[PDB]
Amino acid sequence: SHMRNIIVKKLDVEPIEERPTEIVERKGLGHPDSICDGIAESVSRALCKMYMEKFGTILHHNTDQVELVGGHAYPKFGGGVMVSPIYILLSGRATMEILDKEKNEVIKLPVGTTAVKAAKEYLKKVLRNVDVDKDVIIDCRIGQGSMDAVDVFERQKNEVPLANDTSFGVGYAPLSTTERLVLETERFLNSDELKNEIPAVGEDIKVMGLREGKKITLTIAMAVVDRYVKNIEEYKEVIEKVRKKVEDLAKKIADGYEVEIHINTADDYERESVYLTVTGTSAEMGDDGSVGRGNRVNGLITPFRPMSMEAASGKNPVNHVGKIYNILANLIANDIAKLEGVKECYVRILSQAGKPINEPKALDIEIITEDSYDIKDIEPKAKEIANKWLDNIMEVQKMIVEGKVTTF
């Protein structure tokens, strides 16, 4: 068969849980930076579908550039005022026109309209209390490039792309208790099920987890929607209702740790200086956002784990090696961590320029073994998983386009 550049090594260090400290952050769906990542990736997905429908392949584009300018608002118990809309600028580049010299024809594609529509539909989905007709302006300066039909023909072969570069991706698994608690706290508080029970909870949620030994302090920033709280008393009730939900979640998935929960810690209840919003996001006035300043593709910010600085959101899922490798590294690590005997796993991938993207210069697998396991019994299974995913790298591309994996 085929031999790739895969390295497996035993990593003989303390695993993450046994280290004394951990810090983990997540910017939730309605956080201005996360809004920008989500729009960036939504626009790419929409363009991919546009290209697939017309040509049966995906053409060059990158929409990993989105700027969110905070609006103007005046929150008030019982329902505040949205004064000036949130301004969002879409940027990047996308293939717009195909020049066919053989036929005497030009094909033009709906790049700008597709982008603006995709952005608006994304905001509609995730921001329950934002009226996208009146509360948002979506502007577009996405570059519109041209391309020869003959190069479209080549792309329609849908062969495995060549790496154009020496690029790097890194991932790991499993998530620690603290990581899982931070991730699932945000996910739960932004789930439809919680919203329906406590509509006052906005989507701009930020969760910080500090572990000291076996004590996890969770600090939650949570935008409250002011039409659902008539006074400071009802605001407090919302905080305490959430505090209890999060307590129950901590019992469910971090049993055995001491968990301490703090919510909206900059509040001053008595002065009524609290985290009230009209729309459920501080994008309405308090804060601004842009792409690549938040969660990594695993959904977390983790200064005790290796992190890539590349912004995956909005990059071409068909040719951008960095995006594909950071996602792939995460997927491979996740499967290797499910193997019997693996306590902890790191996967690093480095491309070989001029070579197919599933023929990397190096793919390094670091494994912390459980007690009484031999790295050499695990290695064959681990290499098989890595080779499985590399064989199916085009499947990964498809998963990105269909939104089956996360970019933030």
Residue 224 C-beta: closest distance to Mg ion, Å: 20
Residue 139 C-beta: closest distance to Mg ion, Å: 20
- Of 49, 93, 120, 124, the residue at the interface with ligand 6IH (CB under 6 A) is 93
* Residue (1 or 265) nearer to a second copy, CB: 265
- Cα separation of 86 and 407, whole Å? 23
- Of 51, 55, 228, 275, the residue at the interface with a second copy (CB under 8 A) is 275
Residue 234 C-beta: closest distance to a second copy, Å: 18
Q: Does 185 bind ligand 6IH (CB under 6 A)?
A: no
Structural contact between residues 138 and 119, judged by C-beta atoms closer than 8 angstroms: yes
313: annotated binding-site residue? no
Q: Sketch the per residue contact string, 32 through 61, with ligand 6IH: x for CB under 6 A, - otherwise.
A: x-----------------------------
- Name the binder of 204 from a second copy, Mg ion, ligand 6IH, none, CB < 5-8 A by kind: ligand 6IH
Express the helix, strand and coil content of the chain in percent, nearest 5 each: 35, 30, 35
Half-sphere exposure of 8 (CA within 13 A, CB side): 23
Residue 333 C-beta: closest distance to ligand 6IH, Å: 25
Q: Does 221 bind ligand 6IH (CB under 6 A)?
A: yes
Q: Does 353 bind a second copy (CB under 8 A)?
A: yes
Residue 158 C-beta: closest distance to ligand 6IH, Å: 40
Give the interface segment with a second copy, choosing from 51-59, 99-107, 211-219, 331-339 (CB under 8 A).
211-219
**Tokens standing for residue 105:** 């024809």
145: annotated binding-site residue? yes
- Cα separation of 274 and 260, whole Å? 21
Q: Which residue has the tokens 């209840």?
A: 269
Nearest Cα neighbor of 7 from 360, 343, 356 is 360
Q: Does 359 bind Mg ion (CB under 5 A)?
A: no
CB count within 10 Å of CB 80 equals 18
* Cis bond before residue 380 (omega within 30° of 0): no
* Residue (146 or 158) nearer to Mg ion, CB: 146
Q: Which residue has the tokens 């305490």?
A: 240
- Cα separation of 270 and 363, whole Å? 57
Residue 66 pairs in a beta bridge with 90
- Of 101, 104, 266, 340, the residue at the interface with ligand 6IH (CB under 6 A) is 266
- Cα separation of 244 and 39, whole Å? 32
Q: Which residues are annotated binding-site positions?
A: 143-148
Q: Which residues are annotated binding-site positions for ATP?
A: 143-148
